[PDB]
Design a protein around this ligand. Sequence first.
Ligand SMILES: Cc1ccc(C(=O)O)c(Nc2c(C)cccc2S(C)(=O)=O)c1
Ligand SMILES: O=P(O)(O)OC[C@H]1O[C@H](OP(=O)(O)OP(=O)(O)O)[C@H](O)[C@@H]1O
Ligand SMILES: O=P(O)(O)OC[C@H]1O[C@H](OP(=O)(O)OP(=O)(O)O)[C@H](O)[C@@H]1O
Ligand SMILES: [Mg+2]
Ligand SMILES: [Mg+2]
Ligand SMILES: [Mg+2]
Ligand SMILES: [Mg+2]
Lengths: 340, 342
Amino acid sequence: PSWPQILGRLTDNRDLARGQAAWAMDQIMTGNARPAQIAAFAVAMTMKAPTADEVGELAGVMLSHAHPLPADTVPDDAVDVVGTGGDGVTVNLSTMAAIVVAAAGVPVVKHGNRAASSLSGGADTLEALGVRIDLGPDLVARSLAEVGIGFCFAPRFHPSYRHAAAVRREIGVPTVFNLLGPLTNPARPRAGLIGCAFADLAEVMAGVFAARRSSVLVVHGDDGLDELTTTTTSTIWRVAAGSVDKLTFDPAGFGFARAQLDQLAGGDAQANAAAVRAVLGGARGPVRDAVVLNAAGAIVAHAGLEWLPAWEEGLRRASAAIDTGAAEQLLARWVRFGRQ
Amino acid sequence: PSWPQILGRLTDNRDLARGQAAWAMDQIMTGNARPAQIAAFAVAMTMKAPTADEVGELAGVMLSHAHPLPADTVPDDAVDVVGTGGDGVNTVNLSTMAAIVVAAAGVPVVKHGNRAASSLSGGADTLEALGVRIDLGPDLVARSLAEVGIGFCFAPRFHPSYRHAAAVRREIGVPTVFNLLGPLTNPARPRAGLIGCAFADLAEVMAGVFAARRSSVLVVHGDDGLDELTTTTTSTIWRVAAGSVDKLTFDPAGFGFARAQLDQLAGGDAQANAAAVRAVLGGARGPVRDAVVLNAAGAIVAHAGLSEWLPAWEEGLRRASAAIDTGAAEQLLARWVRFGRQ
Ligand SMILES: Cc1ccc(C(=O)O)c(Nc2c(C)cccc2S(C)(=O)=O)c1
Ligand SMILES: O=P(O)(O)OC[C@H]1O[C@H](OP(=O)(O)OP(=O)(O)O)[C@H](O)[C@@H]1O
Ligand SMILES: O=P(O)(O)OC[C@H]1O[C@H](OP(=O)(O)OP(=O)(O)O)[C@H](O)[C@@H]1O
Ligand SMILES: [Mg+2]
Ligand SMILES: [Mg+2]
Ligand SMILES: [Mg+2]
Ligand SMILES: [Mg+2]
């Protein structure tokens, strides 16, 4: 195996052989790959049109180098709530959804990161709320048990990935690496709500989760958002029993009104943090509807471990988690945990 | 203009706008591009399938940064003989040998060259072994061409700013659009030449660049895989003339050449390849001679195109053969070596 071999096969518009993608990623995750080599592989992989197997191999190598949590500290039915990002458009729907879902009794372990293209990101907003994001495996495990939620800071759990992260910021363009985020949660939850900004690559991610036999809903808003949108219909690749099925989704059937895309606008960590306190404070509006919708999506995924009645219960549990104030309190206990 | 803009448009598989490829190359040449950005741009440009316009812009930027030769020192009918390389076949240095023969036939040759990348010995390496001084500067290369009839432009001496792209090319290994630039960026800027291309899908692109320059060039690719006019089989020739390109297929059998085996054209290190040159110029008959005479003749046909197809090849094959048989080629090499030590 070598760089000329692998890179040459891609430029010829051919799919890689089994195991070649793994080799390339291991060279990167061990510091035996110069930036030039990293960039060439990332671009070539993207333009060739990657397969589920190829992307699956990349994520597998990252997890094998990642810091794991202590044995038997992660529940069997833990869920993730995270997106690829890079939609170009907003408030932190995934982070807000995560708090609600956790408060509803579903164990959540988020694997997030700072912003890359947006004015603010998930981890950035959590830091602005006083949450300690840079905790080690032992403490993340304690947090999950004592609070009901844990946050895995990618740079701390994937320290060997820093070389690849540097190259990404230099080339600046979206690549296959932009898909690896949701696919490399070090806690390894078996369920989650996974957003994808790239419509022509969502089916691929769904394939990767299908191989792991996970219960996941890969979602893409017809308006382009990497979330379950309320401004129009959405596409959903439901993953269950290792089987993917493509379906169109419309929340208007449940009773959600249509919203404009500007009504879901956001800003910096300070402004987005305020949007979190507002929604968790019980404020109604288009932002709330987006959070409840996504939170329900994560609960439907959790249940996958009927279709319509699952959404009804999901929407019901999500709303109640907010209105009782359980979501607001859970956040407070999350902060106090870090200070102790 | 920015890297995200350019790289984004290429990954979406769209052709660039005017000046974008040019902006990209200038950033690389001025040392303002990160190695990762250089690699991303090279690979993206290749997989999209580049156009004659785009490849043309890159070569234009390189030539603008290159060291020029003095004014009115290069004949208007000077020719080049050089290939992309990277054919993956370790052969004797046919372009270099052919270049000497063409020069000896009375056609001024100014050769763009460099050391080997994948092979054991490149043109520059072999010339060094023969005692030829390749490290000459602009003023001295012009003298050589005038006094000897041939001059050698060593790429890194004339293209010092290309060094950033050079280091990246070696780190990634895979061939890209950058592999096409060498034959396209001869600093003497000859209006004719025989250009070898190892990549069949890109040969038509190189011909488009020369056509835009209104040059008389034969872009050649052996159907066996060589970046030369081969003797083992037919060869695909993109005939560039009058701003137009015409794809043709050349068959040496039509001119009484014998089919050879590729192993007969094999080479080795610098010391070995140097000896191979002395053999052919010495008048040794065989498959290597036939290859050199054909490529030499090809360059003469391109030269005549600056002003009939079959009749031109006939005349071309006469002058190439005669250039060796009279010993002019052997004499020109020796005088070339003496010039360096003087
Ligand atoms: C100054 C210069 C200009 C051009 C080239 C080239 O490869 O064409 C070049 N390559 C090169 C050379 C000759 C020697 C050593 C290292 C390199 S590198 C690390 O740059 O590839 C150096
Ligand atoms: O456009 P970007 O610059 O790439 O930002 C998108 C953010 O969303 C992703 O995580 P996550 O979905 O969990 O954050 P979210 O709450 O905003 O959705 C990603 O980690 C980014 O932080
Ligand atoms: O190492 P490679 O990448 O495989 O290329 C072999 C040689 O051919 C090219 O020039 P040129 O055609 O002028 O030299 P030549 O006489 O051998 O043909 C290149 O500059 C190398 O010197
Ligand atoms: Mg998200
Ligand atoms: Mg999003
Ligand atoms: Mg050659
Ligand atoms: Mg060659």
